[PDB]
Design a protein around this ligand. Structure first.
Ligand SMILES: CCCCCCCCCCCCCCCCCC(=O)OC[C@H](COP(=O)([O-])OCC(O)COP(=O)([O-])OC[C@@H](COC(=O)CCCCCCCCCCCCCCCCC)OC(=O)CCCCCCCCCCCCCCCCC)OC(=O)CCCCCCCCCCCCCCCCC
Ligand SMILES: CCCCCCCCCCCCCCCCCC(=O)OC[C@H](COP(=O)([O-])OCC(O)COP(=O)([O-])OC[C@@H](COC(=O)CCCCCCCCCCCCCCCCC)OC(=O)CCCCCCCCCCCCCCCCC)OC(=O)CCCCCCCCCCCCCCCCC
Ligand SMILES: COC1=C(OC)C(=O)C(C/C=C(\C)CC/C=C(/C)CC/C=C(\C)CC/C=C(/C)CC/C=C(\C)CC/C=C(\C)CC/C=C(\C)CC/C=C(\C)CC/C=C(/C)CCC=C(C)C)=C(C)C1=O
Ligand SMILES: CCCCCCCCCCCCCCCCCC(=O)OC[C@H](COP(=O)([O-])OCC[N+](C)(C)C)OC(=O)CCCCCCCCCCCCCCCCC
Ligand SMILES: CCCCCCCCCCCCCCCCCC(=O)OC[C@H](COP(=O)([O-])OCC[N+](C)(C)C)OC(=O)CCCCCCCCCCCCCCCCC
Ligand SMILES: CCCCCCCCCCCCCCCCCC(=O)OC[C@H](COP(=O)([O-])OCC[N+](C)(C)C)OC(=O)CCCCCCCCCCCCCCCCC
Ligand SMILES: CCCCCCCCCCCCCCCCCC(=O)OC[C@H](COP(=O)(O)OCCN)OC(=O)CCCCCCCCCCCCCCCCC
Ligand SMILES: CCCCCCCCCCCCCCCCCC(=O)OC[C@H](COP(=O)(O)OCCN)OC(=O)CCCCCCCCCCCCCCCCC
Ligand code: FES
Lengths: 336, 104, 146, 55, 96, 100, 84, 108, 70, 43, 66
C-alpha cells in the first residue's frame, strides 16, 4: 500500500499541468514530467518486486527476520536511490523539473516544490531503514554533492525568476537527500527539519514570483525592475525572503544547515568546506544579484499600466510563511 | 546578468575607471614598474634605521615563567588526551579525526 | 492596419492575393487568397482539386506557419498537399525545413526540386499572381475514400 | 627570444612530465594497500594485548 | 469575469448625488444625451486608507483570555507534576 | 637630484588609483564570472551534460536509425526480410551450437 | 574539434590511400636561366605535396614557428626527465 | 541594430482564461526584451563536439570531470576515517529497522 | 531637492508630516517602555555576576564549581 | 548528434544502371542544353 | 583570410554577362575607392573578369540555389 500510494500521485499532477496551465509550452512539459517521473517509478517498482518476491510478505516487521545477500542489497539500494532521485531531483535528472516549473501554473509549482518532491524522501527513508546494506555510500554522496554544486553554479546566468527558484529548489533538495546517505544515524534529523524548511521557503518564493507575474505580466529581469518605489510591499517581501533564504541564525534554515554541516564536517572536512563554499557563497551571490536587480531601479517604461500593491491574501500568506519559519525554530527538542 | 539592467541608465556590472590600462597584464606591469620606487624608499628607510639603531631586550615577563610558558609545556608533560576511557570502552583520543599529537 | 477616426472601410478586392494554377488536367485556374493564411486553407476554400490533405495541415500548437519555426515542432504529417512553385517565387521561398524535406522526399509519387507542401506556406504580399501546378497527390489510408 | 629562458621552459615541461607520470600511480598504489600497514598491525596487536591484560 | 450582484440587500451603499449634476435642459442640435445615474461614493470622513480602521476589542480580549488560560493551565500542570493539590511557594527564590 | 619622475602626473594617478589593485582584481573576477558561470555552468552543464547527454543522444540515435528505414513496405523488401530471417536465424543458432 | 577534423579528413579523394595527382603535371620557373629550355617530357612528380601541404598562414608565420618550438620542447622535456 | 522582425513570442493554450488583476491593463512588449526572454530556451548546438571548445576548453574539461574529483576526494577522506576509526560512509544499521519515533503497539 | 508631487493612492513615505505626531509618539513610547521593563524583569532572573570587592568564593561551598562523579 | 544539414536517406538514393555518371538527384527533370537543341534543329 | 563568395561580393547572379560584371565593379568602385571591402571587391572582380578564371571558379563551387 505504501508503494501504491506513492504511485497514485502522478495522474492528478499531470492533469493539473495539462488542463490548468495557461502557457502553450506546458503541453510538452507535462510529457517530460510524466516520462522522467515514470522512469523513476519503474526503477522503484523493480526494487519493490524484488523485495516482495524474495520475501513473501508485505510488512516492514517481517524484514527483521530475513537477510538479504550482498548482491541483492546492492541491487536494491541502487534501484531505490536512482528511482527516488528521479523525483527528488538528483544531478543528472532535473531537466523535467526545470521545464515543469517554467511552464506550470504558479499554484501547482508551489505544490510541486513544497510537498510533492518530499514524497520521494519519505519512501526512500523507509526502504533505506528496513534493509541491511553493506556498501559504501560514497557514490551516492558524490552524486548528491554534484547535484548541489551543479545547481548552485547555474544561478548567476538565470534571468527568469521562476527558473532561479527552481534551481534553488534543486540545490536544497539535493542537500536534504544527502542527509539520508548514512542510514538510520542521527543525520536524518537535519534532513527531516530541512524538508519542512525548504517546503516553506519554496512556497514563499514561488508565491512571490506569482505576485510579480500577475502584477507586471512578466517574470524576466530584462523586462521588470524597480519593484520597490512602486508597490513597496512586494519589494519588502522579496528582501525579507532573501534574508530568510540566506539563513539568519534566528530561523530553521540555520538550524538545518548547522545539523547537516556539523555531521558532514566530522564525516568529511574538505568535502564540507567545498560544499559550504559552493552553496552558501557562489549560488547565494547569483541568487541575490538576480533578485536585487529586480527590486531596485526606476520603473519608467509603462506608467499607464503600472499595478497596485499586495492584497490582504498575499500579505497574510507571506507573513504566515515568515511566522512559521521563526516559530518552528521553537519546536520541542525531544524530536530532531 | 553581466549588465545591471535598468529602464533609466542601465550599466555594466563592473566599472573600469582605470581604462587607460587596456587589460590586466599591462596593469600588472605598470603597477610593478611604479612600485619599484616605493621598494627603493623602504630600502633606504630600513638601511638608515639598521645603521643607526640597536635591537631591544623584548620578551615575556621573567617572573611569569610558570604561567603562559609553564602551561604550554605542562600540556605536553601530561599526555592527558590519550588516557583510557573512563567507562572502559577500548577507545582513546587517538581514534578521532581531531586527535592529540603529543610528539609534534 | 492603419486607420483614423471617421475613415471608410477598405475594399476586399484590393486585398486579394491571386494564385494562378495549372490543374491535373492541364487547365488553368485563378484563386483568391488573403495574407496571414496558409495556401492549403485558400485552396480548400476555393475547392481546388489535386490535393488530398490527409492530415489537414498538422497540429495546432507548434505549427510550420509561425514565422520563426519552433524547434520542438513535429512538422507535416502526411505530405499530401504538394504543389510545384514557379522559379521566382520558389527561389524567394528559400531552403526547406529539414522535416518538410524529409516528408517531401519520402512521398510515394515522384516530386521535383520546386515541390513544396501547401500547408507549410504562409500567404504573403509578394505571392500575388504566383504560378503553381498541382498534379494529383497520392492516397494513403482506407479512410481517404470515406 | 631568450634561449636560457627557453631552457627554463624546457625544464618546466620536464617537471610537469615527471609529476603527471608520478602522482596518480603513487596515489592509487597507496590507497590500494591502506589495510596492509604496520600501523594497522600494531593497532591489532595493542588491542589484543589490552584484551589479554584485562582478561 | 465577475458575475456577482452589486445592488446588495444587507445595507444601502453610502453615496451622494450633488456631485456630477445632469444637464436636462438647454440642449443643442449636436451634443450627446446626458447620463442617467451620476451618484458617487461617500466615505465616512473618519476613514484612514493607510491603516486598519479597526476599533473593536474582540481580538485583544481573545488573546488575553488565551494567555490567561495558558497561565492557569500551566499552574495546574505544575501542581500535578509535583504531586500536590496546589503549588508550594518557597519563602525565598534565587537566580537560576 | 634635479629631475623627479614622481612629481609627474603618471605616478600621481598611479598612486591615487590605489596602485591599480582594484582594476587588476576586477579584471580577473570578470574573467572568472564570464568563463566559469556563463560558459561552463549554463552552456556546458545544461546544454551538453543535462539536455544533450540525457535527451538528445536518444533523439539523434532514433533519427539516424530512421534515416535507414523505408516508411512504405515494398514487396521485394518483404520477401527479402523473410528469407534473411530464416537463413540467418538458422546460421546464428548453428553457430552457437557448434563454436559457442 | 577532433570529430570535425576527422569528418573533413574523411571526405578526401585518394588513390589507394595516397593523395597523389591524377594527371601529369608540369611546372616552369619563369625566372629560370635562358640556357634552360622547355620542360622535358618526363613525369618528374607524381604528387603535388608542394601545394597540398599548406595552411596559408603567411600573415602569421612566427606563431607556427613558436608552436613547433613548443612541441619540440615537450618532447625534449620528456627525454630530459628520463635522463634526470 | 534594427529591431527584430521575427522572434519567439508568448503563447497561450486555446480558450485560456486571461489574468485580469489590477484592472487588466496590458502594455505592448519590447521586441529585444522578448527575444532575450526566449533566446536561451531555443538555443542549440550546431555541430558535434562544439561544446568542448565553446568558451574555455580547460575550464569545460574541469567542469566535466567534477564528479570524479568529488568521488576521489571522498575516497581519500574515507581512507582517513578508516584508520582513525571515524564515521565511515556507510548505511548504518543500528536500530534494526525500528523507525525514528514510531508507534509499536498490538491489538487484541 | 525641489519638492515634486506624490500620487495620493501610493502609500509611500516621501515628505510626510503627521500633525498628530505628539500623541502618537506618546502612545508608541510608553507601552514600549512597559514591554521592555517586563522583558528586563524576566531576564534578571537569569543574570550572573562575579563576587563583589572584598569577597571570596569558598571552594567547598555549594555555589562553587563542581566536577562529575562517574 | 543530429545534423540537420544532412538530409540524405534511403529514400533519396539516385543510382541508375543506365547512367555511368550518376545524376545529381532522383528528379528526372533535366532539360536539354541550348547548343544541343540548336544543333538538332539545324539537322 | 576566409572563404569568400565572389558573386555575392559583386552583387550579381552567376548567369550574368561580362559587361554586367564590369558595370557592377565600376558602381562598387566609385564608392569604396578611397579597405577590406574594397579588397574583397578587387579580388572578386579580378577572378571573375577572365573567362577562363571565372569558369574555373564556377566549376569548383557547384552552386546551391537561393
Ligand atoms: C498589511 C500589509 C502587510 C504586508 C507585509 C509584507 C511583508 C513586509 C513587511 C511590511 C511591513 C509594513 C506593512 C504593515 C504596516 C502597518 O500596517 O503598520 C500599522 C500597524 C498597526 O495597524 P493599526 O491601524 O494600528 O491597527 C491595529 C489595531 O488597531 C490594534 O487593535 P487591538 O488593540 O485590538 O490590537 C490587536 C492585537 C492585540 O494583540 C497584541 O497586540 C499582542 C499580540 C501577541 C502575539 C502573540 C500571541 C501568542 C501566540 C504566539 C506564540 C507566543 C509564544 C510565547 C511568546 C513569549 O492583536 C493582533 O493584532 C493580532 C495579531 C497576532 C495574531 C496571532 C498570531 C501571530 C502571533 C505573533 C504576532 C506577531 C506580530 C508582529 C510582531 C513583529 C515584531 C516581532 O502595525 C503597527 O503599527 C505595529 C505592528 C506590530 C505591533 C507589535 C506590538 C507588540 C506586541 C508584543 C506581544 C508580545 C509581548 C511579549 C512581552 C514579553 C514576554 C516575555
Ligand atoms: C602484432 C604486432 C607485433 C609487432 C609490433 C611491432 O613491432 O610494431 C612495430 C612498430 C614500429 O613502428 P613503425 O613500423 O615504424 O610505424 C609505426 C607508425 O606509428 C606508423 O604511423 P602511420 O603514419 O603509418 O599511421 C598508422 C597508425 C595510425 O595511428 C593510429 O591509429 C592512432 C590513432 C590515434 C587517435 C586518432 C583519433 C582521430 C583523429 C582525427 C583527426 C586527426 O596506426 C598504427 O601504427 C597502428 C599499428 C601500431 C603498431 C602496433 C601496435 C601494437 C604493438 C604490440 C603488439 C603485440 O612499433 C610501434 O609502433 C610501437 C608502438 C608502441 C607499442 C607499445 C604500446 C602499445
Ligand atoms: C610597495 O608595495 C606594493 C603595494 O602596496 C602594498 C601594491 O599594492 C602592489 C600591487 C600588487 C598587486 C597588483 C597584486 C600583487 C600581490 C602581492 C601580495 C604583492 C604585494 C607587494 C608588496 C607588499 C611589496 C613588498 C615587496 C618588496 C620587494 C618590498 C621591498 C622591501 C625592502 C627592499 C626592504 C629592505 C630590506 C632589506 C635591505 C633586508 C636586508 C637584510 C639585512 C640588512 C640584515 C638584517 C635583517 C635580518 C637579520 C632579518 C631579515 C632577513 C631576511 C632574509 C628577510 C628580508 C626579506 C624581505 C622581503 C625584506 C605592489 C606590486 C607593491 O610592490
Ligand atoms: C634614509 C631616508 C630615505 C628617505 C626616502 C624619501 C622619503 C620621502 C618622504 C616620504 C614619502 C613621501 C611621498 C609623497 C607623499 C605626499 C604626496 C603628495 O600628495 O604631495 C603633495 C603635497 C602637497 O602639495 P599639493 O597637493 O598642494 O600640490 C603640490 C603639487 N603636486 C600635486 C604636483 C605635488 O606636497 C608634498 O608632499 C611636497 C613634497 C614632499 C617631499 C618630501 C621630501 C623628503 C626628503 C627626505 C627627508 C629625510 C629626513 C630624514 C629621515 C630619517 C628617517 C628615515
Ligand atoms: C650538446 C647538445 C646537447 C645539450 C644537452 C641538452 C639537450 C636537450 C635540451 C635542449 O637544449 O633542447 C633544445 C635543443 C635545441 O632546440 P631547438 O632547436 O628547438 O631550439 C630551442 C631554442 N630556441 C627556441 C631558443 C631557438 O634541442 C636539442 O639539442 C635536441 C637534441 C637533444 C635531445 C635530447 C637529449 C637528452 C636526453 C637523452 C636521454 C638518453 C637516455 C639516458 C642516458 C642513457 C645512457 C647513460
Ligand atoms: C521576535 C523578535 C523579532 C526581532 C526582529 C524583528 C525584525 C523586524 C524587521 C523590520 C520589519 C519591517 C521593516 C519595514 C521597512 C520599511 O518600511 O522600509 C521602508 C522602505 C520603503 O519605504 P516606502 O515609503 O516605500 O514604504 C513605507 C510604507 N510601507 C512600508 C507600509 C509600504 O523600505 C526599504 O527601504 C526597503 C529595505 C528595508 C530595510 C530595513 C532595514 C533593516 C531592518 C532590520 C531590523 C532589525 C535590526 C536590529 C537587529 C534585531 C535583531 C533581533
Ligand atoms: C569566491 C568568491 C568571492 C567573492 C568576493 C570576492 C571577489 C569580489 C569581486 C568584486 C567585483 O568584481 O566587483 C565588481 C562589482 C562592483 O564593482 P564596481 O564596478 O567597482 O562597483 C563600484 C560602483 N561604482 O561587483 C560585482 O559584480 C559583485 C559580484 C561579484 C561576483 C564574484 C564572483 C567570484 C569572483 C572570483
Ligand atoms: C541637540 C539639539 C537638539 C535640538 C532639538 C530641537 C527641536 C526640538 O526637539 O524641539 C522641542 C520640540 C518643539 O516642538 P514644536 O516645535 O513646538 O512642534 C511643532 C509641531 N507642532 O518639543 C518636543 O520635542 C516636545 C513635544 C512633545 C514630544 C512628544 C511627547 C510624548 C512622548 C515623549 C517620549 C519621551
Ligand atoms: S496537409 Fe498533410 S502535410 Fe500538408
Amino acid at each position: 500500500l505504501f508503494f501504491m500510494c506513492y504511485e497514485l500521485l502522478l495522474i492528478p499532477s499531470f492533469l493539473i499541468v495539462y488542463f490548468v496551465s495557461p502557457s502553450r509550452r506546458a503541453i510538452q512539459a507535462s510529457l517530460y514530467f510524466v516520462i522522467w517521473t515514470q522512469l523513476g517509478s519503474l526503477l522503484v517498482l523493480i526494487a519493490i518486486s524484488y523485495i516482495i518476491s524474495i520475501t513473501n510478505t508485505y510488512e516492514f516487521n517481517d524484514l527483521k527476520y530475513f537477510n538479504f545477500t550482498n548482491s541483492e542489497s546492492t541491487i536494491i539500494i541502487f534501484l531505490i536511490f536512482l528511482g527516488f532521485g528521479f523525483k527528488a531531483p538528483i544531478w543528472p535528472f532535473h531537466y523535467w523539473l526545470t521545464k515543469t516549473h517554467v511552464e506550470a501554473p504558479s499554484g501547482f509549482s508551489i505544490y510541486l516544490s513544497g510537498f510533492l518532491v518530499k514524497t520521494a524522501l519519505y519512501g526512500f527513508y523507509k526502504f533505506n531503514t528496513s534493509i541491511f546494506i553493506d556498501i559504501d555510500s560514497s557514490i551516492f554522496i558524490a552524486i548528491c554533492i554534484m547535484g548541489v554544486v551543479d545547481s548552485s553554479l547555474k544561478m548567476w546566468g538565470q534571468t527568469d525568476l521562476k527558473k532561479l527558484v527552481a534551481y534553488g529548489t534543486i540545490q536544497e533538495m539535493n542537500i536534504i537527500y544527502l542527509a539520508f546517505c548514512w542510514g538510520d544515524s542521527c543525520a536524518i534529523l537535519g534532513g527531516i527539519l530541512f524538508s519542512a524548511t525548504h517546503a516553506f521557503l519554496s512556497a514563499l518564493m514561488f508565491f512571490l514570483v506569482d505576485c510579480i507575474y500577475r502584477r507586471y505580466h512578466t517574470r524576466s529581469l530584462v523586462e521588470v525592475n524597480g519593484i520597490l518605489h512602486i508597490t513597496p510591499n512586494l519589494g519588502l517581501s522579496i528582501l525579507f525572503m532573501l534574508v530568510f533564504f540566506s539563513g539568519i541564525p534566528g530561523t530553521i534554515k540555520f538550524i538545518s544547515e548547522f545539523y547537516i554541516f556539523s555531521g558532514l564536517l566530522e564525516a568529511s572536512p574538505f568535502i564540507c568546506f567545498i560544499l559550504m563554499l559552493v552553496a552558501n557563497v557562489l549560488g547565494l551571490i547569483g541568487f541575490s544579484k538576480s533578485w536585487f536587480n529586480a527590486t531596485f531601479g526606476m520603473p519608467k517604461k509603462n506608467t499607464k499600466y503600472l499595478p497596485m500593491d499586495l492584497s490582504f491574501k498575499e500579505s497574510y500568506i507571506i507573513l504566515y510563511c515568515f511566522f512559521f519559519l521563526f516559530i518552528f525554530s521553537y519546536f520541542s527538542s525531544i524530536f530532531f | 546578468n553581466m549588465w545591471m539592467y535598468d529602464q533609466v541608465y542601465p550599466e555594466y556590472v563592473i566599472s573600469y575607471n582605470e581604462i587607460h590600462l587596456v587589460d590586466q597584464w599591462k596593469g600588472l606591469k605598470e603597477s610593478f614598474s611604479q612600485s619599484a620606487y616605493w621598494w627603493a624608499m623602504m630600502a633606504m628607510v630600513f638601511g638608515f634605521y639598521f645603521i643607526n639603531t640597536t635591537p631591544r631586550q623584548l620578551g615575556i615577563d621573567t617572573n611569569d615563567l610558570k604561567g603562559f610558558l609553564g602551561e604550554y609545556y605542562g600540556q605536553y608533560k601530561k599526555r592527558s588526551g590519550i588516557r583510557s576511557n573512563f567507562l572502559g570502552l577500548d577507545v582513546t583520543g587517538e581514534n578521532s579525526i581531531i586527535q592529540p599529537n603529543y610528539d609534534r | 492596419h492603419h486607420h483614423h477616426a471617421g475613415d471608410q472601410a477598405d475594399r476586399v478586392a484590393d486585398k486579394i492575393i491571386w494564385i494562378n494554377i495549372q490543374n491535373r488536367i492541364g487547365q488553368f485556374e485563378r484563386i483568391s487568397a488573403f495574407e496571414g493564411e496558409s495556401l492549403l486553407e485558400a485552396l480548400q476554400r476555393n475547392k481546388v482539386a489535386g490535393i488530398v490533405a490527409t492530415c489537414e495541415g498538422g497540429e495546432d500548437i507548434n505549427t510550420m506557419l509561425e514565422k520563426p519555426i519552433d524547434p520542438v515542432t513535429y512538422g507535416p504529417f502526411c505530405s499530401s498537399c504538394q504543389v510545384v512553385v514557379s522559379n521566382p517565387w520558389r527561389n524567394k521561398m528559400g531552403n526547406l525545413h529539414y522535416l518538410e524535406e524529409r516528408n517531401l522526399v519520402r512521398s510515394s509519387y515522384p516530386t521535383t526540386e520546386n515541390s513544396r507542401l501547401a500547408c507549410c506556406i504562409l500567404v504573403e504580399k509578394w505571392m500575388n499572381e504566383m504560378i503553381i501546378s498541382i498534379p494529383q497527390n497520392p492516397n494513403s489510408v482506407y479512410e481517404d475514400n470515406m | 627570444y631568450y634561449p636560457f629562458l627557453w631552457q627554463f621552459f624546457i625544464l618546466g615541461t620536464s617537471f610537469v612530465w615527471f609529476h603527471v607520470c608520478y602522482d596518480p600511480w603513487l596515489a592509487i598504489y597507496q590507497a590500494n594497500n591502506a589495510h596492509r600497514s604496520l600501523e594497522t598491525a600494531l593497532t591489532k596487536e595493542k588491542a589484543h594485548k589490552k584484551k589479554l591484560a584485562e582478561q | 469575469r465577475q458575475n456577482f450582484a452589486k445592488n446588495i440587500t444587507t445595507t444601502d451603499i453610502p453615496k451622494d448625488s450633488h456631485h456630477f449634476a445632469a444637464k436636462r435642459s438647454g440642449f443643442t442640435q449636436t451634443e450627446q444625451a446626458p447620463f442617467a445615474y451620476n451618484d458617487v461614493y461617500q466615505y465616512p470622513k473618519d476613514y484612514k486608507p493607510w491603516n486598519y480602521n479597526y476599533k473593536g476589542n474582540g481580538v485583544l480580549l481573545a488573546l488575553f483570555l488565551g494567555s490567561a488560560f495558558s497561565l492557569v493551565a500551566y499552574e495546574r500542570s505544575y501542581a500535578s507534576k509535583t504531586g500536590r493539590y496546589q503549588r508550594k511557594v518557597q519563602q525565598n527564590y534565587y537566580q537560576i | 637630484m634635479l629631475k623627479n619622475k614622481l612629481i609627474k602626473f603618471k605616478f600621481f594617478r598611479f598612486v591615487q588609483s590605489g596602485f591599480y589593485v582594484d582594476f587588476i582584481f576586477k579584471k580577473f573576477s570578470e574573467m572568472f564570472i564570464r568563463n566559469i558561470f556563463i560558459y561552463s555552468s549554463i552552456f556546458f552543464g545544461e546544454k551538453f551534460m543535462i539536455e544533450y547527454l540525457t535527451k538528445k543522444t536518444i533523439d539523434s540515435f532514433i533519427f539516424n536509425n530512421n534515416r535507414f528505414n523505408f516508411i512504405n513496405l515494398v514487396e521485394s523488401k518483404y520477401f527479402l526480410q523473410i528469407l534473411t530471417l530464416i537463413l540467418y536465424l538458422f546460421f546464428i543458432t548453428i553457430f552457437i551450437l557448434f563454436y559457442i | 574539434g577532433v570529430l570535425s577534423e576527422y569528418n573533413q579528413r574523411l571526405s578526401k579523394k585518394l588513390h589507394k590511400g595516397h593523395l597523389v595527382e591524377d594527371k601529369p603535371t608540369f611546372f616552369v620557373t619563369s625566372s629560370r636561366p635562358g640556357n634552360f629550355g622547355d620542360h622535358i617530357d618526363f613525369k618528374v612528380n607524381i604528387d603535388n605535396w608542394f601545394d597540398e601541404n599548406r595552411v596559408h598562414n603567411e600573415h602569421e608565420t612566427d606563431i607556427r614557428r613558436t608552436q613547433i618550438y613548443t612541441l619540440n620542447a615537450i618532447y625534449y622535456g620528456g627525454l630530459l626527465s628520463f635522463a634526470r | 541594430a534594427a529591431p527584430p522582425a521575427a522572434f519567439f513570442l508568448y503563447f497561450f493554450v486555446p480558450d485560456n482564461f486571461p489574468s485580469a488583476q489590477s484592472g487588466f491593463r496590458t502594455a505592448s512588449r519590447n521586441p529585444f526584451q522578448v527575444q532575450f526572454v526566449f533566446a536561451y530556451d531555443n538555443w542549440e548546438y550546431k555541430y558535434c563536439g562544439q561544446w568542448w571548445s565553446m568558451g574555455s576548453l580547460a575550464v569545460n574539461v574541469l567542469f566535466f570531470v567534477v564528479p570524479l574529483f568529488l568521488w576521489l576526494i571522498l575516497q581519500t577522506q574515507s581512507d582517513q576515517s578508516s584508520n582513525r576509526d571515524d564515521n565511515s560512509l556507510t548505511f548504518y544499521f543500528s536500530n534494526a529497522g525500528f523507525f525514528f519515533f514510531q508507534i509499536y503497539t498490538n491489538t487484541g | 531637492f525641489q519638492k515634486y508631487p506624490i500620487p495620493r493612492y501610493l502609500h509611500v513615505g516621501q515628505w510626510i508630516v503627521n500633525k498628530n505626531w505628539k500623541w502618537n509618539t506618546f502612545h508608541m513610547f510608553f507601552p514600549t517602555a512597559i514591554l521592555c521593563f517586563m522583558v528586563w524583569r524576566n531576564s534578571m532572573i537569569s543574570t550572573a555576576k562575579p563576587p563583589n570587592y572584598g569577597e571570596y568564593v569558598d571552594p567547598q561551598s555549594p555555589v562553587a564549581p563542581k566536577a562529575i562523579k562517574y | 548528434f543530429q545534423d540537420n544539414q544532412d538530409r540524405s536517406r534511403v529514400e533519396t538514393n539516385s543510382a541508375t544502371w543506365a547512367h555511368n555518371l550518376p545524376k545529381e538527384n532522383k528528379f528526372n527533370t533535366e532539360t536539354l542544353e541550348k547548343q544541343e537543341v540548336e544543333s538538332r534543329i539545324l539537322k | 583570410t576566409q572563404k569568400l563568395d565572389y558573386y555575392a561580393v559583386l552583387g550579381v547572379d552567376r548567369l550574368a554577362t561580362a559587361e554586367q560584371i564590369k558595370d557592377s565593379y565600376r558602381k562598387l568602385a566609385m564608392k569604396y575607392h578611397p579597405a577590406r571591402k574594397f579588397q574583397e571587391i578587387a579580388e572578386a572582380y579580378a577572378v571573375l573578369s577572365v573567362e577562363e578564371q571565372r569558369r574555373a571558379y564556377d566549376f569548383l563551387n557547384q552552386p546551391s540555389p537561393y
